[PDB]
Amino acid sequence: EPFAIVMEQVKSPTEAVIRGKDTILLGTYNYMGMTFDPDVIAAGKEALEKFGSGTNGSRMLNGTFHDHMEVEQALRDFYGTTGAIVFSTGYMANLGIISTLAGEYVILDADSGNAEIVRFRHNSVEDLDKRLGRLPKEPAKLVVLEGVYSMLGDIAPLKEMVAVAKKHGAMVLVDEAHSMGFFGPNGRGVYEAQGLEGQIDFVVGTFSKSVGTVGGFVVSNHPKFEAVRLACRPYIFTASLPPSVVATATTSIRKLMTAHEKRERLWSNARALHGGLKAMGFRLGTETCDSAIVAVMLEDQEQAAMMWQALLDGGLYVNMARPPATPAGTFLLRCSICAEHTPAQIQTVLGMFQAAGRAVGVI
């Protein structure tokens, strides 16, 4: 029962009761705190009251299930695209879609049937060019990239990689799950913050992180991007989500277009914590605060385990990362900031990290 976190009573997006202790939550991905947004709950409750617990399929001549139409329109507005397809689960979008779009080549980061897999060195623009240039020119290619790397919390040099992909006419898919609602002028993701609107073919994402519900999505401006809905070799098995789930998702997505205060709060919190932990002499994954993830690097599994324990006991919950996920000898304590964390909470978090870090011998 490793690092099993069971949250018995949940006060808010930033605090719950874990093992009988009032604990600050700092290891979940509820970036914009939408899971408890008053309007979101209300929408969910209304949908429950008006439409009940579930509905039936109502397919309408194409893989548009009638209950997704509204949420799919919210995504169109949010991303400013013409195409939007909602999936029942995050993964049916996460990697489900890749096997759908690809004998053909799939080129993806090393630390990211019917498709030849090609792995390029992590964050290496040049290895991407080298590996791409060694491939047969005729066949169809898809390059998969992430806006934010969830491990250390750094930024992919998309602008450079995207251009290197188009050097080869390859199609580009970008995952913007860890950026939704707080990167670029409209909060569309890292791709937007780097001025790539219109140069990216497909943007995948999930409702788990910022939106705050089950499911995922793809968005595109590809004229033919409706055919996707009907892919039955790479399945269009998918369920229609219940009234409350779609209601919540829609409301949440629409609110994410205007949540300027949450967006400013998220970054303050992120920068406050990043700078703070750094000034205590912690080895962080990034020199500059690049995203909402702040990862503290430790060099000893035991030491990492103990600090986590100390932090939890002290009233703070953060993520534990280790190999296999990380490079061997790399152990991470991973903080994920919430737009709903108060400046006071961030100060308490800093106090706690100091206290714990000292006690264990990290600082």
Next chain:
Amino acid sequence: EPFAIVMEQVKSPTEAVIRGKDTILLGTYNYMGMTFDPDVIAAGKEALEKFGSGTNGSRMLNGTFHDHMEVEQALRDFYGTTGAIVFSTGYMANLGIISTLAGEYVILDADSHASIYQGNAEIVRFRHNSVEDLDKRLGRLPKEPAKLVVLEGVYSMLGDIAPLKEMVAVAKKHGAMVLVDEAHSMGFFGPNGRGVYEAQGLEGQIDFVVGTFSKSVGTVGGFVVSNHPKFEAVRLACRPYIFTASLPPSVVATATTSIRKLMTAHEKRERLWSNARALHGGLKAMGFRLGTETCDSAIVAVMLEDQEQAAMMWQALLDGGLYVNMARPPATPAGTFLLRCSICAEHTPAQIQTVLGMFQAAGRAVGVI
């Protein structure tokens, strides 16, 4: 835009507004009417208020989402088993599980569910409802490899019953594993409403029971239940549940409440059958060709022999204020066109009378009777 049914305003499980008309609903699979059950709604609302619109994964050693633990316990109690695995979607359970459990043979009915009718599994199709073709085809297979026979309790097309008792015994003649879909039976077949398998006294002889929350339960998702000791390993199956999501607080809450209520909903169960039998007998006494001579399930299918005629009667019925299902080949044998009624435990005896009146009126006008 074929027979597209969009329900703008939904009064209850049995009536809504379709194309500006107050319409009786008789083509959905909300058998026990749980989608609007007061306790179910309440449970959903509270879970939303207490736990929010969603929670993170909280997956563990055995891929078990903490958020499913409670709903998975309800299934254990309901089916009286030790094993219960909830899935994010109906299909991840419906056929997802089959490809999971099977260079191996999968033996299934030729008309296997519109979900069932890829990879690592050699497909073997036996003649519909033919106990003997099942024996014949099974006996022609290599003895050594692992085999799974998939069967349904209720055939959704005509609304008849699989002779499970016989087929199950024929499978065990060959040591093959048995999977039974009990989606169209949940809550109203057998002493505990566990399905056709139970009504035929097969408790303990069936390896896996699959099902969905769509029909009786009244929400997204599906499940498998088992008594197999090793039936926890499945959770960690290379592809088919390490792509599963944890359902949000309101979905789980609703499902649990609904499932627990389905253990005691005796009145609903007695109402469902009355409605089913009233309709079946009634339509029959008007001279309609039904899929079954006796009322065997909650599905009552009217058989027509002409696509155009079938299409027009559906149109007439809809205009008259009734919504039923249209079935056509590819889903049916060619030249078989069905109007499929699906009874609800929440249909009043008055509504069933109105339905009969409507079917009479329409059928006459079109030329079916």
